[PDB]
């Protein structure tokens, strides 16, 4: 609720901007660095005192004439070096390590544009990507092997864009334009078995190529949540939040109130709707919102550059006491929003290559 | 407004409880969030993280681009040189899909849809509190005005009490279950009969009420009837009991479970006489007191018919040239058009002969072994008796639509060594499913294609274009989507059904089109299911890419497949 | 080859449809499963096969039949088989011999 736009920046490339992420995998006293991807440019910045934001290393995709769409920070346990993977219209994964100056791990095999990059909370070696081919293929980066693929034949007949790990990396919730609300359990005994051999497979040991599993059965699915294009969903602990073109915010849980997510069956079809934080003037899809590290502070952008901020305190959608911030200059189109690893600093990015930084009056 | 308020409140009793409930689970979520976030944050503390490093100038790349990131605020504009990213190839766009080899057949508006019956129960609460003013007061708000006169309707509507539910209304448990009731023979078989589909002789054939009524009869006197006193206490060992058995053509203290009596009812319909086989089938009871139980059963249940037939025809008078003449009669009637390909349908002729009213005759098709037409039906395919192998022009199978039946092409080894991959015939690979080993690689003409690892000859089997069974109307609707997306994984199976390969299929769906391709496509007809076989026009060697003609219009050809990649030599 | 008589996902696809039906008890519902699974395992087409296949099946999982207590339910399945004229008289006899 207590926030103000302290810094504002703008890329000179004037290109529409895309996903921005913050280095949550950090340490106390580490530089407060966040990253940004444009059409073919990838860049990072560090927030500083007095609203200062010094520019950091920025690379350019001078070869692939395609628009980057998603990016996410990465960690390596071997070198303790942070990394970051990116993808876009061509759907090829580039994961750059800033320390080594370049990217060495290349991932191809997906079809149309990749529209999701987001790593497992526990293993940094695991990254499941979502693209326009309806594929939930996951890559074991450290081993450079394909991992078990979800969805497929029984999955989404339409494109998928939104996917989320829960806090423990227990289950993966996902949905796309299909309006199908499907999740798959990571804790499925079969896949850890594949996961275990995935971490130690070597094609040089035996001719037998790796056998990734294919999965076509969610723990649950539904389509009664939205009659319009759902564009954002996130793991709200045991609940599931959602965003759609209809300018309505709906969190929900499967089945009835007493129905646990892990106890539920794929055959279930009941849903418990509980979210009512509706908004307006953001009818276009492809929007993406973000959450704080502690799952406390919620902020939403808008097509008209306005801010739609909420909290996860005793404040509940029973009355929806909103805090709708707005900046006069920031009004063109908010593409992506991202919290820092705190409730004080937030980075807001407009479509017109411009970046707006808001800080809390804590 | 007290009655109106209570109607508002009565609804609100559930509503604020939900408000209490959502808050209650919210705290449970929050503590779990605090549990999980703190636990995760602990490892974040442990993992040392390398701080960021700033860019440095490159002497060998002094010509790289430089971007001056503007600052919207008073902060100075900051510049940094650019770095070229990695160069990687591209794979042509495709959609996720899964293998298979058989075939397969195949918003968000409003809330709660209706006036909830919960309010009716709340109205019932307004009824149970119960002079005439009360009846009118109940009548005041609800559309079903609950006056004492209309309270009678309320009670009648309350007579429903509970829905029967989705379960077998009759007590028909598994016969292995101890609670298996004395279900009669047909009711027990009813579940299996509905689920079973003899077309593929499987239960719930998801590729095929379209089932036989099995109301037929068959000879039962094939048993040897080798009576012998082999069971100490049997149908034998008692001359009076054994002689009394001849008349049909008191048990001991032993008793029989209700489940046993059910399968006792089942067993008689199989042999009608073989009480000895009952002893070996179920070890709980000896033939005696089961033979005697059947004596009791024969006295209770009406005796079985046990009728045998021979049919007036014995032999001859059935030359296959008449069949061809019968086929000639059908051919000249409507098969002259050769455009209206109707998929096979099992015709039912319980009493009527194979008259011109036979659905296959109307569908200009031959009856099959599954048809309810008798074994003398003058439409069924005779066979594939060619001595060398059912593969060439002379053979009726290869000329006709019929892939040679496993039970009919007796000379071409159709039934023989079905497990063995190699066989004399070349018109039963689709029956066996013996494909080739196709390859996937980005086709040079356009996007993906299908390659072959080995040489293959002309006029021989290639992998079958399997897919999904779908009707024309949905095919155009889905095709309209694919037509918008230029995709054409649709195939004109027959005039009555279409097969589509976008979502579900096998590898060969990526085969590209050519106007003079080395490989062709011909619909075949096998085992009652039309399919489309693929065969190479000419001799092929290792590594050649596969092509086949789509048979589209020339306008559609340039609309879709306008690339051919071959000029004239002179 | 990346392909066989029966791709995996179909198996999980069909068994889910198996549990969809309500009027079939679980004891008589499981007998549906393993029967159809072995059929698609080998892809029989002709009458000669199923007479041999049942003997192949009964030895393949006859011990498993004991554990799941579907021996008697499977007998009714075999009874339906002869009703379909698809099985012979003595084939019923040999099944019990392998069964016990
Ligand atoms: N010879 C040809 N020239 C141009 N387009 C063709 C073609 N043969 C097939 N196509 C198109 O390809 C579509 C099938 S999808 C296969 C396309 C391509 N092989 C790829 O993998 O990307 C059809 O809709 C058809 O319109």
Author numbering:
A (entry chain G): 80 to 441
B (entry chain E): 17 to 122, 158 to 181, 220 to 297, 304 to 344, 431 to 751
C (entry chain D): 583 to 682
The authors write:
To study the mechanism of EZH2 automethylation-mediated activation, we set out to solve the cryo-EM structure of PRC2 engaged with a substrate nucleosome in the absence of H3K27me3 or JARID2, and therefore with the am-loop as its only source of methylated peptides for possible allosteric activation. Cryo-EM analysis of automethylated PRC2 incubated with nucleosomes containing 40 bp stretches of linker DNA on both sides resolved two distinct species: nucleosomes bound by a single PRC2 complex and two PRC2 complexes interacting with one nucleosome and with each other in a non-symmetrical dimer. We additionally observe an unassigned cylindrical density contacted by a positively charged surface corresponding approximately to DBS2 in PRC2prox that may correspond to double-stranded DNA and is absent in the PRC2 monomer reconstruction.
Polycomb repressive complex 2 (PRC2) is an essential chromatin regulator that harbors histone methyltransferase (HMTase) activity mediated by its catalytic subunit enhancer of zeste homolog 2 (EZH2). PRC2 is the only known factor that establishes the trimethylation of lysine 27 of histone H3 (H3K27me3), a chromatin mark associated with transcriptional repression and whose tight spatiotemporal regulation is essential during development and differentiation. In addition to EZH2 (or its less active homolog EZH1), the core PRC2 complex consists of suppressor of zeste 12 (SUZ12), retinoblastoma-associated protein 46 or 48 (RBAP46/48), and embryonic ectoderm development (EED). The binding of EED to trimethylated-lysine-bearing peptides is central to PRC2 activity since it allosterically activates EZH2, a requirement for efficient trimethylation of H3K27.2 Upon engagement of specific methylated peptides by EED, a flexible loop of EZH2, the stimulatory-response motif (SRM), folds into a short α-helix and stabilizes an active conformation of EZH2 by bridging the EED ligand binding site and the critical SET-I helix of the EZH2 catalytic su(var), enhancer-of-zeste, and trithorax (SET) domain.
